[PDB]
Amino acid sequence: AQVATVPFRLGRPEELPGTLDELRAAVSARAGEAVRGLNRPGARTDLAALLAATERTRAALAPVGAGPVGDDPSESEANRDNDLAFGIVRTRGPVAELLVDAALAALAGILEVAVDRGSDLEDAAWQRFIGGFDALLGWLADPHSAPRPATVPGAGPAGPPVHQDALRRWVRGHHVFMVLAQGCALATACLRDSAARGDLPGAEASAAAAEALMRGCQGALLYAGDANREQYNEQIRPTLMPPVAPPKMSGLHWRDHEVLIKELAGSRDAWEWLSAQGSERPATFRAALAETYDSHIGVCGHF
Template sequence: MKLVMLRPVYLPGDVASLRSGPVTDAVAELGPLVAARALSEAELLARLEQIPIRPAGVKIDRSAFSDGLPRKERLFAIHDGFFGVFRATDATTELLAHCVLVGYRTMLREAARCGTTLDDEQWGRLRHGIEATVAYLLGLPIGEPRPTPVPVGADALDPHRRWRSGHHVFFPLIQAIVLGLGCFQAAVNAGRTGEADEALAFATVVMTASSDAMCFASDFQPHHYGGAVRPAMAPPYLPVGLSGVMSEDHDLLIRRFRELREVFPTLEGRLGPRREAFIAAVEGTYDAHKRVCAKFDGEHVVSLRMSADSAAKAVGVLEQLERSRLNTLRSV
């Protein structure tokens, strides 16, 4: 299971740069159908099976495999390696679209095989977040989420596969939020209110969907996490305990949050309510993350990034991070 993603520092900085980039014929044909949800789930999956994992000619960035990387870059490489993520630096818009569609395919395959305990509202929001990302890349309306019947699969669920499948959807969504916030800030700085409103609305939709992606990734019994998934993310199987803060997409997202401290307090008119909706979506995503963590006994076990004798339990660490992030967005 592989996912080829753009290094987030190469994300377009504004809408004009994003939509001036080329897309492959496959994306140009399938993208509008995905954005409009014009296909049945079976038809969509059959069409997605034809999408290559990366556009023709895109080369993998091999720098992450080099010796002597700085500590932060080493942690990024460990995180990507565990989840089967490879990075590239070119074909920006093409690669963004392919990454989203490949993640969508992985999720639909997994759900068709094994089903999901997400309800129709959650499944509809999750699918909408992916479809909205494709729409935003192509300059199409992002529409509204709607409840969608969940797939019913009869195969036995593999917790390792579900964990990785869910993250292969979660990661492109996080990158899409970074993209939306970058386009929002560029539009605000240029005085383009309509473009800023579109970008922040998009980031809000995708932020909401990311919480459902976490629920999908953790859609298995708690004893499978403690007995199989969690040990695989810690020594001796990995050099260090794995954490979401080791993701370079998450790292850039937090930088975007800090940059918003200068912008959010100045928003007026329709952008004021749009800001509050985004902050509420961030809060909802942290709440979902805490629920997932609590499901896996996070109120009693320490984070993988902490020493085993730490008094800070995993849910408590998330609560501290949530307060910090929300205070940043609220400029408190």
């Protein structure tokens, strides 16, 4: 709808790989391809060359999209109406690899608005918001090491509020939601499985990934409220037409989020175990967890 790139191709989060080896054989090749693209020389000079590097990458990548899923018996109309409301199409194929395509796609959608009209988002929250991508692909490229954070160029100050440009950021921002939710649901499921299997180094890297993805979502919830407050201001105009309402998430029941909270649940015994084995991620994750829960206020409706 010219506000966002549609349809947004995405995998089925239930089919996400469940262990660290199944994730590596499935996605480490295409993710390492993406990491090479987003860190090829010159890409991090400013915000422009980063967006250009994003497009060269996903262009060069052989698309795996085996088309829309279609008839899904495990999808409810609560998931479908939630997927429709932001132009999401569940796509067949390598669900892990599709997540790399969705991560590259959603980032480019975010970098477009930031190149033309800057961002009044704070330069510290802007880092974790974009750093969540470096975390996802960096960890997807090597699921057995903690991703090392790369540099993220800054955004210019917010220029002129173009008509419904806060709606572009509102829809494009909710795509990053489903990208980071699937990614964070992975590292939690890997953390659960590695802890049960006695894989301490695997539990560490999985916890390091999930934390950087949690901090990435917190900056995403700020980016969302930045546009939802700019939306609330855009509607003081009395409108003789029926006031077109912004698309909202209907309750807790959108598919990727349903999966993430189920993974975070039941991962309780693994965090205490990491804390007992001398880790420092159980601490800084609980920080990122509560910072994300507080950041829902101003973004989610039933909240």
